[PDB]
Each structure stands twice: as structure tokens, then as C-alpha cells.
Amino acid sequence: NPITSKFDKVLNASSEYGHVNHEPDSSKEQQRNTPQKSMPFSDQIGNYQRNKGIPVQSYDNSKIYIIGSGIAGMSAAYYFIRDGHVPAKNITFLEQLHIDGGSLDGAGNPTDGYIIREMDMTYENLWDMFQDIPALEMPAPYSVLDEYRLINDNDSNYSKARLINNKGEIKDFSKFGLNKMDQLAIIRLLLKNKEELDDLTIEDYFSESFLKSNFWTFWRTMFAFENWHSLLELKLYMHRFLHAIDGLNDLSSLVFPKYNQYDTFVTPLRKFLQEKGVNIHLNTLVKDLDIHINTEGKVVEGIITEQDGKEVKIPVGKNDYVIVTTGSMTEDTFYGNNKTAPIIGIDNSTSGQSAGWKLWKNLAAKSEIFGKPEKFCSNIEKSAWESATLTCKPSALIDKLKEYSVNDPYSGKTVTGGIITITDSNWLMSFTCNRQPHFPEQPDDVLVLWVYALFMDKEGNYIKKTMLECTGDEILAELCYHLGIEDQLENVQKNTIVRTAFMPYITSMFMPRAKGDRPRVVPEGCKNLGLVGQFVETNNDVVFTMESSVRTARIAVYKLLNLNKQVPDINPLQYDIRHLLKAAKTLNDDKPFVGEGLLRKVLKGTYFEHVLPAGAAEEESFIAEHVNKFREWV
Amino acid sequence: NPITSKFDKVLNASSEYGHVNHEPDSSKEQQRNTPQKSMPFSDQIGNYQRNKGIPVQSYDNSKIYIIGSGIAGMSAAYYFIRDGHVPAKNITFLEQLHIDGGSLDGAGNPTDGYIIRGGREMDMTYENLWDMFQDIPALEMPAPYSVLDEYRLINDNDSNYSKARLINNKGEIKDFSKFGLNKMDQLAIIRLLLKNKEELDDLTIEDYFSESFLKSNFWTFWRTMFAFENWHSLLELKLYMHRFLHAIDGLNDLSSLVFPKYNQYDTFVTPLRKFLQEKGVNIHLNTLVKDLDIHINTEGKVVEGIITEQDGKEVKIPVGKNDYVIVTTGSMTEDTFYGNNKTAPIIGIDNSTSGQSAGWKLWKNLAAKSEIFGKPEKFCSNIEKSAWESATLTCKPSALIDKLKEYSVNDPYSGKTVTGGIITITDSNWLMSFTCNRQPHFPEQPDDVLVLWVYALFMDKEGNYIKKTMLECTGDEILAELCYHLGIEDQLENVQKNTIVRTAFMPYITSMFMPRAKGDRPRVVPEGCKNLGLVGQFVETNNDVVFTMESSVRTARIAVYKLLNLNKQVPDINPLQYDIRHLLKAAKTLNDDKPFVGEGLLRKVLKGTYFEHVLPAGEEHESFIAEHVNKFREWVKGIRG
Ligand SMILES: Cc1cc2nc3c(=O)[nH]c(=O)nc-3n(C[C@H](O)[C@H](O)[C@H](O)COP(=O)(O)OP(=O)(O)OC[C@H]3O[C@@H](n4cnc5c(N)ncnc54)[C@H](O)[C@@H]3O)c2cc1C
Ligand code: NA
Ligand code: NA
């Protein structure tokens, strides 16, 4: 290796070398400094993790096919280039739909109506990439991270009207409303081993009181969880975003890109990849892979496609690699507009038949290590909801909107601060106005609001139809009803372009799963295939995030090429005592939790007083009882 | 602003723009997610912090003068260029000595002998150092690889650890498996942690810790790998504990460390110099800066000139309305006296005129202008307290190397970890330690030569075999005392003919650890200063410790970011002390890996759960829980007491 020549004496005598664990597991690692340890801890994020890849061989004669060009696949290419030193020209995207980007869309225009189908700072893998990706609206040497922080540093995000009911009156959202039994259920969930929860659903575990709580109203709307989704995934979210728990009620835990995610993240990434010399196919349908299995392992040696109307097989040489974004969330989307309801063209009998789902189904046929696609896409009634993009000119809508806004909508600063959930709406309907303009070329008198509902089988309060039955102007009617401007519905409809989208696989990611149902990024025996997206398995990260897309991509690269590089686990902020205690206090609506009073007497006046959370707690009396309550809990 | 153009609407209605806290204090922050928050928490390290500076004006007309070409001065240059967009042309260094680099020296040759005044033990928590060096061209790897890359190429594939941390009785390995802290001495450590930083003014270490503590293997470990003397700052020791709480369990075998492939001049300094020279920064060697010209009026402090001693003459370098000045207000390697095999270092000062060397005069002069520039005399007024000596052994094959090979984790000539760090001769009168890092230690070091490093902590003690104080000894004599404790004193002649020795007496090596009080160290940019920044090991930061390279890079970034009022922050130290996993591990370690109070209770709760791995390494019934609870409540009770 002409890269490592001055180290060959050491590298050859190394036992670590080439046997790297590219995906360390923080949920199993007992962190100790021993003679064995030569690598950082499994979640030791920081600048020390900013070293680059060292390929052990040339990849000049190696081709790379990437099926699907969401962030997940473009991420794989970036790292193959950066860490594998694979020539960019050797990489080919075979795209399914032929607007790149996937679930991150910026479709539409002011005339026809825009159409769209939330992050925090712990998106660690995302920003490992985007800090070296050229900015949209800043000159060199500035990056996407730079402009992201240029606007988020100087305009805090928060809500002042998180919850409304009674035709527009602001509902109180200062408290979670969790009783003791439910606070215990959350805690026991955090303690439960991950492998013990196969196929269990949220409503299987949590009480009715929990499900009626503000906490769950907060969590279910902002994250898009349904009562029948995966218990495990919810648990993972809590571990993942524990530090954030005190800013859920007012969405102060969040930050947002200047524009829509397509224009902010997808375009600059694609543009960057297009500059180094990457190839893109916008007319190749991938239906299956040609995999050869034997005693040794699994090798992809061909890609079965449908170009035009014929079936063309792309050969995959022994030295080539393949990346697959195995599932789709936006597939089979059925749109609608103002005068038009979406005519849904499938039921649970035809669900799972589509370009994207079929490819995974064909993989599963080959070997059981490719997962169980049918568990995710076999119940549209459970994995669907409908979003509506509002293109708005001055209206009674915008009038009422300004009452809910933090800054003036047209100001370019934070507006609604995130979704505004209509508590007493039958659909469980939420809407949001992000920073305007949401689109770079948006007109100065146009606002783009976004709407969303969680119950697909309930008749609205005002419009006595289910949401998928409604026209654009009818959802406005249902919206206007809950905003007390029903009596001005005409002014709104004549000035608001509505484009709806019914997505049957939008929460298929969250469906109850069991062991082996999701493949690993690089399944047993696979020498040259990688699986990335919201449907492959990572150690502890969550899904329905761009972070998982990037996380899975990096794993693919490093594991396939056997690089020296790791992908650290999720940000260890849950282990931070400050966020543990903050969480405990917040779950309890600032009531004194157990041991707090004691903990206050000991730390107040010390170095660690700042560790104590916000609120007020006072202090063998009844210690004999908590002993025997805690003694019985275990 | 042509950078900001696309954001003017929002920025001109922002409450935060131009009011960033460039040095957030994690020691005071009640971390909460509130409407008021837009920045990350004070110590939220990671990639989100990898954004860049956005200067609000041009600096093409702005000259920047940097006194001191050490890792702190070069760092200020790097960040001025990186985040200030300051033309590298516009930057000039002014150095006192013959060569660039400062305390990270790496001179000498196989014929005269090498000389390293010292080595660099490190951790992965050096966030600012690595925020910089991750973008600095590698020495021994081609483009596009960084110093960070070649650093990890060697350290990822070769663990550092020791199998002979303590030796005594003329060669024998002392058992170094335990800390040996007792009930009371442990608790005294706990309390120090809990004490507010503001209450420890002028307190020394021996002022606070028992004699048992000071004889514990813990303190033997700590005092030798951190160069602490019993008469040093209590606050500093505490700061260290907070800083390196996560490393406490790998101190006894030094498994908590990583080392640069070479001396830090070749590994760190030279790559960075090369980088800055190429962009076009200027340097002036052998130039002594005696004093600054600061104009102080009703509205602030402004540097307006630099008074220099170039050669023998005195020259005054003017400083303009638009110019900036960065000062390294003290060097721990100031006024070194060198010796060798046949010569003891002939000490040209001793207490009577301790502190009247140059380099101190600049800080001394500055302190005369305003109390806000601190009190240098608290640091350079006692050579007997601030000094010790190191020796550099350039070794051909000899009975010394043969003995060394028994202490070595890997064969000395291999290129892997050798001693694993310092080996401390427990019962040496000088309290002498010695190390052998990965060899070669210099890029051009011969195949049959090894470089060994030796230092001692007691300067006023007659040796065990040579009945003199260390600074009285010739290089040959230091070899005698050393050979005695290794058991080779009967082959001293062989060792002497095959080992070149260069010693370095450093009168102010540990001057940074001297006890201090409120105001004794100036802030990086003192109150009123519009164009002066102060960097290095003698200036004030929120929580970081001194005698590290990390602090020098830390202070440099604070300098740039405050002086230019940038959008950029300097996060506090890595928050591993708040990691419940390192908390519990510390407690268990401080108790010789026997169960600490409370652990049993905790183990009843987390064992068999998602959080089992949190429990440290080393089960009674439900009936005894009411006991464990009361004995726990009783323990926290007596903590304050
Ligand atoms: C022997 C030794 C062992 C060490 N061990 C470790 C270790 O194991 N691990 C670790 O992390 N760190 C260690 N350190 C610390 C590390 O080397 C230093 O903290 C770091 O290099 C700080 O450098 P600096 O830029 O702050 O100042 P220095 O490098 O001390 O000074 C830089 C230069 O500024 C010059 N200067 C000062 N005043 C003036 C003036 N008025 N005019 C002109 N020039 C001036 C000086 O001549 C000096 O050469 C060690 C240091 C030494 C000396
Ligand atoms: Na709150
Ligand atoms: Na140990």
C-alpha cells in the first residue's frame, strides 16, 4: 500500500488491523480503559472521529451501482468516494422514480401549487458529510452546515400555540399530564432489553390514561406514531431523544433548515456528486438482483432491470458493489387537489406490489437474511396517512395564522415553530408554517403551509367524510372549522391552492417487527452488497430520520471495503446525568421525584448545582415505605 | 457583507447576532431546552460544531503580530486564517529563541545526542487540537491525509499500556494494581470534586490531603504522569480530576493514553509550521519582545506598539488602528540550562533572581499597566518549587537496553508501544521516572539507536547511589543512579560508553501549577482590550487544565473568536464527567474495584436490563436492601458534614 508504507512494520505486526468493528454497539459495551482498547468508546463522538478512510487496495477497476437516490444512496456514494477513494465516474445511480431525493421532495410551483410530502443537533453522521458539502446560498469555502447554523444560531425555534381546540382557542401545553403508573411504564420500557419486545405494539403496553395524555398527544403528532405501531421503535426514540424531552411541549428542542429538505440537503448533495463525475440513470427500473449463493457466501453478479419496456440485465463483475435502498415510504402515492379527491387504487390485496417493494420481496425469496418485507407493507390501513400542502395568498387563513405565529409569517424567522395540533379534531389534524420562503424561488406574497392528519377512517367535525374522501376545498373547510373561520371559507378557498397526497407506506417503517425482519446493512455472507434506508437494521438508531439514511450508508461503505473506519453509535446524551435528571423532573410535571430532595441537599452549593433541573424539592419516617415500594417494584 | 447577503432579512432582526458567548461555561449552565435557546449546550461537542467563521468585515488592511511561535501562537494564526479570513501575508511571528516550536522541542542528532525536554501523553478528548489538525497535511501520508489520519493509523493498531508502571528494590516490578486509598482519603477526593472552584484560592495540595493519600499508589501515579508536586495548586488538581474522570481507570497501566508517532516537533509543530509558511505567514527568530505599547483611556485598552530587542539593539514595531496582537504570556521552558555526560547544568540563577529572565519581563511589564493582566510573580518567584530536570538518553546496544527489554510490552526496536509510558522508580530519592516511547522517536533515528527519556521530581534530595542532588550530577552520574535502581550498576561502564546523555534543567517547568487566586491569570481577552489576546498556559479558561497542548489551542481559538466577535463558539471540555458510565466507573476504581456503597442497590435495579453495561467491573438478598439504603443515606449524609 503506497498510502501506508511508512507504517508497514507496525501495521503487519498489528492484531487490530483489518479486524475493525465498523459498527460498535453502545447498548452492550462496558466502557473501560484496558490494555485491549486502542479505539474510542463505541459512542465517543468528537473530532477524533474525523480521520478518513484508508483503502487497502485500488478501486479504479471497480464499479458501483446504487439502487435508489435518496439521501441514503447518495450518502453511500459520498463515502465510497471519500473513504474508499473510488473514482466518482465509476458510480452509477439507477433511480426508480426520476426526480432524485425520494421522501425529501420540493415539487410544485406557485401557479399549480407547491407540494411537500424535523431535526436536532445530534444528527451526527449527517453533519459528518454536510460540513464538507458546498453551501447553497453562501460562497466558498462555506458549507451546508454553515448556512444551516447561520440561520438557526440567530433564530431560535419554539411554539406559542402547540395545541389548539374549540375552533381555535389555544389549549394549555405546559404539562405532560402523566400519572404515576404511566411514568413507571415509561421507565420500565427504558429498562427493557431490546430483544424482548418482538411484535408488541404501543397500545399493547401503555395504559389508556397514557394514550390520552398531553405527552402522547405531543409525541404521536410530532413523530407520526400510531397507537398500533412498534413498541420497540418508540423505546428507541426515547433513548435517542431523551435529552430533548423538556422541549417537546413547545418544540424548543428542534431546529429547521432554511428551505424544504429537498432544496436544502438533496440538491447540494446531488450537485456535489454530479461535479466529481457521477453517473445517473433516469430511465432504469430495477426489479430484482442476480445473486449467486454457495458454500462461501453471497455475490451480486447482475442487476435485473426494466429499461424502456424490455428487460435488460446489467452485469455486476466480481470486483463491483451494489447498494439498495430496500424500502419506499412514498411509493404508490395518490395525489389530489382542490376540486379533486385522491382516487386510491389499491387495497391490502394489492399492497406490496410496486417497483420498490417488489425488489425487496424478491430479495427475501433468495435467503431469509434479507428480512421480511411483508410485515411492513401488508396493511395500508395501518401504515398510511395523508398530507396536504397549502399554497397561500393573503387570506382569512393567514389572518388567523398570525395569531399563532411567533414572528410574522413573512419575516423569514420562525413562525408556528412546528406543527400545531388540533386536539378535538376527529382526524387528529396538525398544520405548520415553517420559515418563509419554504422554497428558494417562492413569491413574496406567498406562504406555504403544510397539513397532516393521523386518522384515515374518521369523519370530520364539519365535513362528515374521512380525510381521504375529501377534496382540497373540503379539507380547508374542516380546517377552517377548527380555526373558527368557517364563516369565511369562500375567501380561503379562492386564495389557497391545496395539493393532497395519500401515502400508504408512510409509516410502514414503524410497523411491529421481530428478529430477522429487518436485514443488517451487510447481511451474513454478502461480499459485495449493501442495504441502506429506513428498513435495514442499525444497532440503536431510529428510523424516519435522515440520520439513519446516512448512518446506514456509512456502515455499508466501511463494512464492504473493510475500512479502518467506524460509525460510532448514537449520541450518548441519555447517559449524561444532566439529561437523566431533567427527564425525571419533566416526566413528573416538575413534581419532586424520588431522591430529588436528598439530591438537592447534597449538590446545592457545590460544583454540581447546575446539574439540578428546573423546579422545586423538599426532603426513618416514610423511608421505610419507599424502601418497601422500591423493594417490591423489583 | 457579501457572505451574509442572502440572510440579511433574518440577521438584521436577530436578537443574537453580534452577541454570541464565545466561551460558554459548562460549570454553570443549567442545560434546558427553552425558547431562548438557539445555540448548542456549552459542551455539546460533535460535528454540529464544525461550522466556520463568518467575519463581518474585511481584514486585508489588518496586520497581526504573534509573540511566541509555540502551538498556541501558531494556532491563533491558523484560526485567524480559517475563521477570520485574514490574509496569511498579514501575519508575523516574533520568536525569542533560535528555532520555531517552543516547549514541543525535538533537537539533537545521533552523534551529539538527541534532546527532548519532554514528551506528550494525550487523550482523545483533545477536541480543539484535533479540530485543527484534522485539516493539516500529514507528515508521512500523501494527500489528502491529515495529521489526524497518520496519528490514528499508528494508534488504532497499537495499544499503549504498561506492564511495569512501578519498579522498586533495584529493579523489581512493584504491584501496581490498586490505588490504595482508604475510607477517608477517598471521601476527601469526592469532596474536592464537589467544592466550588471559587473557594480554593491559594490552597496547596498538601494543605488538604492526608499523608496516607500522599503515599497512596494513586498519588504516586498522579504526581508522576502529571508532574504534580505536593506544594502545587489544589484547584489545578481538582480541575484535572474533572477533566480526566473518564481516564481514571486506565491510569495505573496507562491504557488511557495515546501517543504521537514521533517527538511533538516532528509530529505536530513542523506540519503546522509548513502549513502556515505555505499560505504565506512571516517569522522573525531570535527576536525578544520586552514590552507592549498599550493606550488606556476612558473607553478601553488599545495596543499601539511592540517594543522589541532584535539582537542587541531596541526596535519599536508600530501597531495600527486595525491591527491585532496575540501574546503567549509565559513559557514553562523559559531559561533552560543544558548539561551532558561530562557536564552538570551550571545554574545561572537561583531564587535570588528567580523570575528576572526575559519572557517573564513581558508579562511583568504588562501586569504593571493594569491589574487585569494578572500577577506573574505568583508563578515565577520560586525556582525551588517550579523546577525539575529531564535527561535524554541516546542509546546504542548496552546492558541498559537489555534490562529495558524486560519492562517492554513489545520489543523496543519494533515500532510498537515499549514501556507504555513512564516507569516510576518508587523508592528512588529523586523520585525518578523513565519512559521509552515507540521507536524511532525521530524520523531519521538510526536502526540501532533508541531514545530514552528520564525525569525526576525532587530537586533537593541526595540520590541513593550518587550522593548528590540531580542538578549537581553529570550525565554519566545520572546513568549511575539510574543503573543502580535497575540493578545494572555493575555494568555501568558498558552503559556509559553506549549512552549519550543530555540533561535539561527547567527552572519554570512546573510554574503553571503554582497556587493561584482570583485574578492571577488574565482572561484571553481582558476587560477593555479591543485588539489584544493572551494565549497559552498562563491565562484563564472556564474549566480546562494546563500543562497540555489542548489548552494552548483552546486559548488561541478564544482569542480569535472574541477579538473578531465571530459567530463561532468554543465549547467547554468534553462532558465525560457527566457520563453516568464514567461516574460509576470512577467510584468503583477509587475503591480498588471492591463494591462501593450504593453499588449493590444499583445492581439490584439495572442488572438484566438495557442499562446493565453501565455497571462497573469487579448477589445478596432482598432482605438486606433496607440495610443498604440506610447505609447509603448515611454516606451522602457525612459527605458535607
Ligand atoms: C517537558 C514537557 C513535558 C510535557 N508533557 C506533556 C504530556 O505528556 N502531555 C501533554 O498533553 N502535554 C505535555 N506538555 C505540555 C505542552 O508541551 C505544552 O503545554 C504546549 O506545548 C504549550 O505551548 P504554548 O504555545 O502554550 O507555550 P510554549 O510552547 O511553552 O511557548 C512557546 C514559545 O513562546 C516564546 N515566548 C514566550 N514569551 C515570549 C516573549 N516575550 N518574546 C518572544 N517569545 C516568547 C517562548 O520562547 C516559547 O518558545 C509538556 C511540556 C513540557 C515542556
Ligand atoms: Na418545556
Ligand atoms: Na486498570
UniProtKB/Swiss-Prot annotation, chain B:
Biased composition (Polar residues): 32-47
pH dependence per the entry: Optimum pH is around 6.
Induction: Strongly up-regulated in cells grown in the presence of oleate.
Originating gene: ohyA
InterPro entries tied to this protein: FAD/NAD-bd_sf (IPR036188), Oleate_hydratase (IPR010354)
E.C. number: 4.2.1.53
Subunit structure: Monomer.
Residue ranges the record marks as coiled coil: none
Temperature dependence: Optimum temperature is 25 degrees Celsius.
Renumbered residue ranges of the record's region Disordered: 14-47
Natural source organism: Elizabethkingia meningoseptica
Keywords of the record: Detoxification, FAD, Fatty acid metabolism, Flavoprotein, Lipid metabolism, Lyase
Family: Belongs to the oleate hydratase family.
Cofactor(s) listed: FAD
Name listed for the protein in its UniProt record: Oleate hydratase
